[PDB]
Each structure stands twice: as C-alpha cells, then as structure tokens.
Design a protein around this nucleic acid. Structure first.
Ligand SMILES: [Mg+2]
Ligand SMILES: [Mg+2]
Ligand SMILES: [Mg+2]
Ligand SMILES: [Mg+2]
Ligand SMILES: [Mg+2]
Ligand SMILES: [Mg+2]
Ligand SMILES: [Mg+2]
Ligand SMILES: [Mg+2]
Ligand SMILES: [Mg+2]
Ligand SMILES: [Mg+2]
Ligand SMILES: [Mg+2]
Ligand SMILES: [Mg+2]
Ligand SMILES: [Mg+2]
Ligand SMILES: [Mg+2]
Ligand SMILES: [Mg+2]
Ligand SMILES: [Mg+2]
Ligand SMILES: [Mg+2]
Ligand SMILES: [Mg+2]
Ligand SMILES: [Mg+2]
Ligand SMILES: [Mg+2]
Ligand SMILES: [Mg+2]
Ligand SMILES: [Mg+2]
Ligand SMILES: [Mg+2]
Ligand SMILES: [Mg+2]
Ligand SMILES: [Mg+2]
Ligand SMILES: [Mg+2]
Ligand SMILES: [Mg+2]
Ligand SMILES: [Mg+2]
Ligand SMILES: [Mg+2]
Ligand SMILES: [Mg+2]
Ligand SMILES: [Mg+2]
Ligand SMILES: [Mg+2]
Ligand SMILES: [Mg+2]
Ligand SMILES: [Mg+2]
Ligand SMILES: [Mg+2]
Ligand SMILES: [Mg+2]
Ligand SMILES: [Mg+2]
Ligand SMILES: [Mg+2]
Ligand SMILES: [Mg+2]
Ligand SMILES: [Mg+2]
Ligand SMILES: [Mg+2]
Ligand SMILES: [Mg+2]
Ligand SMILES: [Mg+2]
Ligand SMILES: [Mg+2]
Ligand SMILES: [Mg+2]
Ligand SMILES: [Mg+2]
Ligand SMILES: [Mg+2]
Ligand SMILES: [Mg+2]
Ligand SMILES: [Mg+2]
Ligand SMILES: [Zn+2]
Lengths: 146, 62, 37, 176, 214
RNA sequence: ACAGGAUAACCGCUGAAAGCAUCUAAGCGGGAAACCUCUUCCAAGACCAGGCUUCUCACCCUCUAGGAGGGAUAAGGCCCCC
RNA sequence: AUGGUUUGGCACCUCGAUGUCGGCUCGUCGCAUCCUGGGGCUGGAGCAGGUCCCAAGGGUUGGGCUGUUCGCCCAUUAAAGCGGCACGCGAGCUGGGUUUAGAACGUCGUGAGACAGUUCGGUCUCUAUCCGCCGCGCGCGUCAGAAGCUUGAGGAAACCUGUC
RNA sequence: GGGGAUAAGCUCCGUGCGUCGAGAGGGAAACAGCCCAGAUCGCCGGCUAAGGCCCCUAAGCGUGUGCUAAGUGGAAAAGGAU
C-alpha cells in the first residue's frame, strides 16, 4: 500500500512572485507547477498538495514577439453573434489580472479539483497586497541547470 | 513523486535514474517513492550516490 | 490603387518597397501605384 | 550605415550632455532630447565631433548607426539655425493670416478653420497668400506642414490648395 | 452637478403657452428631498448623495430604518433612494441633513424622468413584441394569433437565447430622455413636464438633469 | 447622438540600411455607422458570493465533559385580515 | 486557384416511416456590400458617374398576373443585396400543385389502362416527459442574526435615415 | 492497373499483400481498416517498440551547431517581390 495524503495533514505555504519583465508562458507554467504541488513529493492527484501563491504587479507582464498587439483572448456571451473580441493591449488596459488568471486557468486540471486549486491563486495589479499577515516567502523561479 | 523529490533535492528524475543505474543499484521506483516520502535523509544519500556515480561529462559521444 | 498579386515597375521610374508585409510599388506617375495582395 | 560612419561635427555655440542611452542637445535655439535604440551606442569625440557606435555588424547596428547620426545632425542643425517651410495658396477667395499662436484660414469651407500650434514652433505671415513656418525641430516642422497641407484635398486641375515651395503639380485637362 | 430629486406623479395636464401653443404636461409633485448620507470616495469607493423623502408613521417604519434616519438627523422618509455625483465639486455643496427642494431647477433645462412602468400582467406575444397577427380566416386552426415558427431545424437545432416571445411585460424601471421642462413650482414643490412620463398616478418618479442635451 | 480611446483601408513627417530615394525596420502623427466606452435596462448564485450604514449582541440545562443533545427568547420574518 | 450555391456522379446514414413546393409568422448567420460610412484612380471641370479596397452597425416596397419560387409589368424609396440555416421553419397554420381513390378531353394501346399533357372536387392527428427558450416562484449558501442602500465584474437593449 | 477527370469513404481486378471482419492493448484528441504489437490467469516489479519528454499529462522548460519573425510551425497553387 503506497502513500496517499490525508485531509488536514496536508500542509500549505505562501509565496509571492513579482511578474515584472517575466515571460508570460514561463511564469504561468512555474506558477501552475507550484500551485498543483508537483514540486512537493506528497503529490497525489485526488487531493491537492499545492501552496497559496500570490502574484504582484501583474500589469508589467511581458510577452515575446509582437504578441502585444496580435494575441486574441476570446469568449462568447451566450447568444447568437455574441462573440467577444479582445487583445492583450486592451486586456491589460482595462483589466490586467485577467491575463495571468486565464493563462493559469488554462493550465490547471480542468476538472473540479483544478477548479478548486484555482482558488488558492491570487493576482494583483500594483506592487502591494492586503495579504501581508500571512508572511509570504519570496519565490523567484529558477531552473535546474543541465 | 520521484521527480518531485529529485527536483527538491536539486536533480532531475531522469538523471537520478541514470546515476542510480550507473551505480548499479537494484531498487525500484515503488521503494524509491516510499522512501522519498518517508526518509528524506535516505533519499538525499541515494541522490548523492547517483550524482557521484554520474560520469564527468554528460555530452561525451562515447 | 490597383490591387493584385503580381506587381511590377511599370516605367523605369516606379519604385517597389515593403510595408508591414504588404509589398507595394510607388511612382510619381500616380496611375502606377499598385500594391500586392 | 556608412552614412552614419562619418563623424558629425559639433558647432562651437552648441552644448551636448549625454547620460546612459539618452542624449540632449542645448543651443541658442532651444534644447532637444531623444532616446535612441538601446543596442546602438555613441561616444562624444574630444575634437568637437559626434561618433555613433554600433555594438555589432548585424541588422540593428548596421541600420541604426546612420539613423542616429542623421537624427543628431538634424537636431543640431535645428538647435543652431533651425528650419523654414514656406506655404503658398493659389486660388480665389483663399484668405490666410496669423492671429496669435493659432491660425485662421479661408479655404472656401463654409465653416472657419482654425489650427492650433504645437509648443516650441513659431509662425509668421508675410503675404496674404504666402507665409512660412520657423521651427527648431524638423519633426514638428514637417508634422505641422503636412497637417495644414491636408486641410485641402488634392487638386490636379487648378492646383488650388496649400502646397510647399518646391512642390509641382501634374497637369490634366478634360475634353468634355 | 448631476443633481437629482424624487417625486410622485399625481395626475397629468396641459398648459397654454405664452408661445400661444398647447402642451400636455404631467404633475410630478417634487416633495422636498432630504440628504441622509454622503458617499465620499476615499472611504466608500465613489461619490454620491443619499436621498430620502416622504412621511411614514413611526410604527409603520422598521426599527433599524428609524435608527438609521435618527443617526442621519432627519425625520423619517417614505422611501430611500440616492443619486450619484460626477465630481466632488457638487459633493462639497452637499451635507448630511440638508433639505433639497425643486428650486434647484432653472427653467429651460431639459430633464430626464424615470420610474416603474405600468402593471400590464402577463402578455401575449403579439401585444408584447409587436408581432403581426396571422390570417384570421381562410382556415386558421386554433392558430389565429400565436407566434409561429421559432427557429432553424436541427441547425442550430436550438431556440437561440434572446428570441422575443411571450413574457410578462411592464412593471419595471424605465426612463424617458430629453423632456422639456415647462414650469417650476417653488411654494408647494410642483414640477410640470411636457409629454407623458412613465409610471402611474401615485407612482414614484425620479427626475434629474437631462443627460443627452446637457 | 455629441464626445473620447485604440484601429481598417488610406494619407503622412523625420529617417539608414543601399551617400540618393524611402509612411518604417527605430520613433511620432492623422484616419470610418466597423471594436471599447459614452445612452437605457438586468446584474454579488460574481461560490472571487463584494462594499456602507442602523437594531437584537448574553439566561439555562443536560449529557460527560469532547463535543454534542433538550429550552429562553429580541431585531426582524411568516400567517392571518382588508 | 476558392466556395460547396446550380446541373451533376457515388449509393454511406434513414423504407418495423427523416412529410415535399409556395404562402403566412418568426426569424439567425456569413460577406463575394444594395444604401447609408471611409478611401485609391480615373478616359474624376463641376454635378453625375465607372471601377477597385476597408466595413456586416442598421435598413432594405407594395401591388396586377400565375400555386407559384422565378419573372414581366405599374408605381415608390437610399436601397428594393447574394447566399447558408433538412432548397430555415406542418409535434406553429394553409393544401393552392405536386401525390391515392370519380370523371373528362387530346394522345398511345384491340383492349384492361397509361401519359413528370391538360381539366373539377378531394379528412393535415398529438393533453409537452427531457433538452431548449420566454417569464415568475420555492430551498440553501454567502461563517451570530436581521432592514435597507449600493459599487459593479458581467449580460441585454438601441445604433436607420429623406426633404428644404 | 481498367473505368471515372488520375473525384469521391466510387466501381471492377491482381497481391503464398496487410489488417477488420473474426482483435483486446499503446500512439495519431476523438477515429476497424493508418503506425507499434497478439490479451491463459494474478502481482502496488523491471526493460523496451511506435509516439513523446513546459502544464493539462509521464517523461530533458537537455547538450552543441545553424535557420525562421511569418504564430510560418499550427490548411494550397500558377505568379510576384532590394
Ligand atoms: Mg405598446
Ligand atoms: Mg395580426
Ligand atoms: Mg381541424
Ligand atoms: Mg379561431
Ligand atoms: Mg529612402
Ligand atoms: Mg519619399
Ligand atoms: Mg455576497
Ligand atoms: Mg417578528
Ligand atoms: Mg447504401
Ligand atoms: Mg445505414
Ligand atoms: Mg429506418
Ligand atoms: Mg408510419
Ligand atoms: Mg416536414
Ligand atoms: Mg417540405
Ligand atoms: Mg469585404
Ligand atoms: Mg463612397
Ligand atoms: Mg470607379
Ligand atoms: Mg456589409
Ligand atoms: Mg449595430
Ligand atoms: Mg440561413
Ligand atoms: Mg425546407
Ligand atoms: Mg430562414
Ligand atoms: Mg431553406
Ligand atoms: Mg404540437
Ligand atoms: Mg415537441
Ligand atoms: Mg396535393
Ligand atoms: Mg390530382
Ligand atoms: Mg380513376
Ligand atoms: Mg379520336
Ligand atoms: Mg388494338
Ligand atoms: Mg369538389
Ligand atoms: Mg395532409
Ligand atoms: Mg391531434
Ligand atoms: Mg410534457
Ligand atoms: Mg461593466
Ligand atoms: Mg491505386
Ligand atoms: Mg459499393
Ligand atoms: Mg488477427
Ligand atoms: Mg483494435
Ligand atoms: Mg486512444
Ligand atoms: Mg497472449
Ligand atoms: Mg484530462
Ligand atoms: Mg508531468
Ligand atoms: Mg533532448
Ligand atoms: Mg536547455
Ligand atoms: Mg549551433
Ligand atoms: Mg498552420
Ligand atoms: Mg504560401
Ligand atoms: Mg518568378
Ligand atoms: Zn512609374
């Protein structure tokens, strides 16, 4: 019998990650890995082992190429011809957090356990957060050289 | 689980397996995972063994 | 603004230039002005 | 590129201070500041000359060396003596004058047309249908020139409308 | 700035112009509104003024509502409704407990009046969305007056959310824009407006400076 | 509707690559019932369930003390009537 | 070369049932745009055109004739768009022809009958379970409980134009 | 290969062709017929084929050398282009 994690025995932790001048894709991938908890060696798909990750200053996120005017986030309200058209520039101008939020919702397991994990992520626009009472630990994403 | 443990110990799972084999260990991934979640100290020792058994150059054509 | 896929300098004076991928040719003779596409 | 390779000379009555990638040019006619593309650099020659430096021999540097050199030559020329762009209106009932910083025009439109002068540019009307524009920055001078040129549509038949000095208009006449 | 007032429709009438014409007009008794709260952006999230008007017996009014009014420092009001400001300029000229009257309006200013529409009850499609009635002879079979075809067929194979069909109509907020004002009362809070504003005699109407024209 | 912002096509200024020329690859501009707002309505089941006021804010019992089970109610709500 | 719309080929789905043309009501989408909007060029004096580019927001006749779709005609408007949507839509209606049973005409057949020739009349069923959709309610959660007021993510509505 | 138009998931032949039919498993999302490969049963063991190794999803956000600015990659021609 292998190991499966208990209900409350699982442990969380808080990290804050600035997004200034960070590549959107790489930041999203690292955030999703940490969110699901794959870094932890207690990972078990049925029960999340992730950590509350808080993203700060999300308006300065950067993307490669000329995407800044040719990325096309989509959605449809629900009625015929209710298709909605938007670009990264407009999205950042009007509601920034949505960019990273959509990026990571795409990565998370689209089942409901993933819909839940989605909760434990929070993204802000400016370099400040009312979550200062949880002592988040700065977490700069790095690669294992090889 | 093994990949998670190796990365937390600063090594990639494939390298852990390669070094472990090159050292000629006969333990399998079930025991690997159970240890990795039970005795991080033993997992650390095993990863040091794997790294030490890891040759100097990894890109050598030989 | 003659629009078509084959663009070529008409007289010895036309110029062929590029702009945002849409290659167009320009000349003092306004009639020559043609883009590609 | 090799256009920008030549050394741009600094006139005596000129001041230039550069920090980082930004540069500024001071003179009797005003001060202009611009930021150049990061990859290309530039040094201030001890002999009163301007030398723009391209860190590489590839696309960005090869293209931008001469670009920066010509931009600096243009801005130095503007801060030393400036530029002028005369504009004459040929046609009937075309009244053009200068009242203060703004401009009032009579181009035949049923409503009066007013153009607001951007800062740092000076105007003066010398003839009822002839006048010039005196400004420091070639960019603004040309921008205003084009803006007030476009207040009238192209005219091939009579050539009516505002036009530049050295501009000539093609002739066309219809039979019936 | 974006001033506002509540008021009641008590009837509606016509006046005879000095312009020598004739104009229908609605009686909107604009009782004196009372400011019972302030919306400071720094501490609430925006700028706006709280408003209340009317008279209710204290036993007819809820205890919490009475307490809130008392903390406001004004007598009880029959309902509560608050209008928004566009800048703190008009904000600084408003103060809790202040009384507001119809005087605020200078004649010649377009106005906007809005309030609950009439109670029409559940309505057939033809009346509701202005359909056309089918042929009532030549052989209709219990279909003289019903909607009829409703969408595509197997493509989209659905009924297209948004299709306008039968549904209880009326009795909801509605606004009429750009109504000319005609006469402002001062002594007894009355206001006369050209046209026919939505609502009902004894209904509640909120008036404000017109948006479109000014 | 007006107005505003970023655009289509289109029109441009200063510009080397390529001593020229060049609306452009650096930059800066104009540019339409098209897009986003502006106008009106719905709208915190927005599960990320928001924010602002005002009122009732402490009497018990018991089980076996771990938590839980049996009552007290006011603010207000319901029913009732017209 | 493109699209899959017309005439077509294949017979893979449906013969223990997939109702067919028009009309009526209702629409919905694409854009190869009919007008309205913005441009380039003219063999564009102007008005008025021609042509090509961007643009789908909105609007886009009524009658006489025939079952008609279509089309012609009359007379208007800025226009009277092209299409996709089971040649949109009969568990919403009509049955006018197509499409049974009578009869008849011409024609083929000695014949009985027949004729994508014509001509007259000829039963159109369903109380909505689910999805769907238009409205209106019940329960619970929003972390002590209540009455109010909201901010607004987020949806919806409207968006036409002539004449002087 | 015939016919069709070198069109059809078309039709008609040959294959000591293959597979499905009468075949489970993995890959190409989904997909008998295409690719890898034959399910006696069980094992909470290991090595591999095709295909893959940033996340959904297991595996290098690997090593070194070059190309691309087109989201080409991630639908297409005649022709055209400092
Ligand atoms: Mg009505
Ligand atoms: Mg009717
Ligand atoms: Mg009947
Ligand atoms: Mg009847
Ligand atoms: Mg040039
Ligand atoms: Mg030029
Ligand atoms: Mg809430
Ligand atoms: Mg009560
Ligand atoms: Mg068949
Ligand atoms: Mg079949
Ligand atoms: Mg069948
Ligand atoms: Mg049957
Ligand atoms: Mg049918
Ligand atoms: Mg049919
Ligand atoms: Mg088009
Ligand atoms: Mg036009
Ligand atoms: Mg034309
Ligand atoms: Mg169109
Ligand atoms: Mg529209
Ligand atoms: Mg259709
Ligand atoms: Mg049909
Ligand atoms: Mg239809
Ligand atoms: Mg159809
Ligand atoms: Mg039915
Ligand atoms: Mg049904
Ligand atoms: Mg029939
Ligand atoms: Mg018959
Ligand atoms: Mg018979
Ligand atoms: Mg005979
Ligand atoms: Mg015979
Ligand atoms: Mg009969
Ligand atoms: Mg029938
Ligand atoms: Mg029936
Ligand atoms: Mg039913
Ligand atoms: Mg909103
Ligand atoms: Mg063959
Ligand atoms: Mg066959
Ligand atoms: Mg077999
Ligand atoms: Mg198989
Ligand atoms: Mg599979
Ligand atoms: Mg076997
Ligand atoms: Mg999955
Ligand atoms: Mg993985
Ligand atoms: Mg590799
Ligand atoms: Mg690498
Ligand atoms: Mg290399
Ligand atoms: Mg592709
Ligand atoms: Mg190609
Ligand atoms: Mg060629
Ligand atoms: Zn030419």
């Amino acid at each position: 019998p292998t190991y499966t994690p208990k209900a409350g025995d699982t442990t969380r932790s808080w990290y804050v990650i600035d997004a200034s001048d960070v590549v959107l894709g790489r930041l999203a991938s690292a955030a999703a890995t940490l969110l699901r908890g794959k870094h932890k060696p207690t990972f078990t798909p049925n029960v999340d082992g992730g950590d509350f990750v808080i993203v700060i200053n999300a308006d300065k996120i950067a993307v490669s190429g000329d995407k800044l005017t040719k990325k096309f986030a989509y959605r449809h309200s629900g009625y015929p011809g209710g298709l909605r058209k938007r670009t990264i520039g407009e999205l950042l101008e009007k509601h920034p957090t949505r960019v990273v939020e959509n990026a990571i919702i795409g990565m998370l397991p689209h089942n409901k356990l993933g819909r839940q994990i989605q909760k434990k992520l929070k993204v802000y626009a400016g370099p400040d957060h009312p979550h200062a009472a949880q002592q988040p630990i700065p977490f700069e994403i790095k690669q294992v050289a090889q | 689980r093994i990949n998670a443990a190796a990365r937390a110990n600063d090594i990639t799972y494939n390298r852990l397996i390669q070094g472990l084999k090159a050292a000629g260990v006969e333990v399998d991934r079930k025991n690997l995972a159970e240890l990795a979640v039970s005795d991080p100290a033993a997992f650390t020792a095993l990863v040091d063994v794997a790294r030490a058994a890891l040759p100097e150059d990894v890109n050598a054509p030989s | 603004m003659k629009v078509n896929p084959s663009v070529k300098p008409i007289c010895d004076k036309c110029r062929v230039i590029r702009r945002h991928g849409r290659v167009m040719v320009i000349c003092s003779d306004p009639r020559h002005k043609q883009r590609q596409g | 590129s090799r256009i920008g390779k030549q050394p741009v000379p600094v006139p005596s009555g000129v001041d230039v201070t550069i920090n980082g990638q930004n540069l500024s040019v001071k003179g009797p006619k005003g001060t202009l500041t611009l930021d150049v593309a990061e990859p290309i650099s530039v040094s201030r020659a001890e002999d009163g000359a301007i030398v723009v430096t391209r860190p590489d021999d590839e696309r960005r540097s090869r293209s931008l060396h001469g670009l920066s050199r010509t931009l600096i030559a243009n801005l130095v020329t503007g801060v030393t003596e400036g530029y002028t762009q005369k504009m004459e209106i040929f046609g009937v009932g075309y009244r053009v004058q200068l009242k203060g910083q703004n401009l009032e025009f009579a181009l035949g439109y049923s409503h009066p047309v007013l153009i607001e002068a951007p800062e740092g540019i000076t105007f003066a009307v010398e003839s009822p249908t002839k006048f010039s524009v005196s400004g420091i920055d070639k960019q603004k001078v040309g921008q205003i020139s084009a803006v007030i040129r476009r207040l009238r549509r192209p005219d091939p038949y009579k050539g009516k409308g505002v036009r530049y000095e050295g501009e000539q208009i093609r002739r066309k006449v219809g039979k019936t | 700035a974006r001033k506002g007032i509540l008021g009641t429709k008590l009837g509606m009438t016509q006046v005879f112009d000095e312009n020598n014409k004739v104009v229908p007009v609605t009686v909107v008794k604009a009782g004196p509104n009372v400011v019972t709260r302030i919306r400071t952006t720094e501490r609430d999230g925006y700028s706006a003024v709280q408003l209340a008007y009317g008279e209710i017996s204290p036993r007819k009014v809820i205890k919490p509502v009475a307490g809130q009014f008392a903390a406001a420092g004004v007598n009880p009001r029959r309902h509560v409704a608050e209008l928004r400001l566009d800048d703190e300029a008009a904000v600084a000229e408003y103060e809790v407990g202040q009384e507001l009257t119809a005087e605020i309006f200078s004649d010649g200013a377009y106005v906007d009046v809005t309030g609950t529409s009439k109670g029409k009850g559940f309505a057939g499609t033809m009346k509701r969305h202005g359909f056309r009635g089918q042929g009532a002879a030549h052989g209709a079979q219990a279909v003289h007056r019903r909607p009829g075809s409703i969408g595509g067929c197997a493509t989209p194979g659905r009924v297209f959310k948004g299709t306008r069909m039968s549904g209880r109509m009326g009795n909801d907020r509605v606004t009429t824009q750009n109504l000319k004002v005609h006469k402002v009362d001062a002594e007894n809070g009355v206001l006369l407006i050209k046209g026919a504003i939505p609502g009902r005699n004894g209904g509640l109407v909120v008036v404000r400076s017109a948006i479109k024209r000014g």
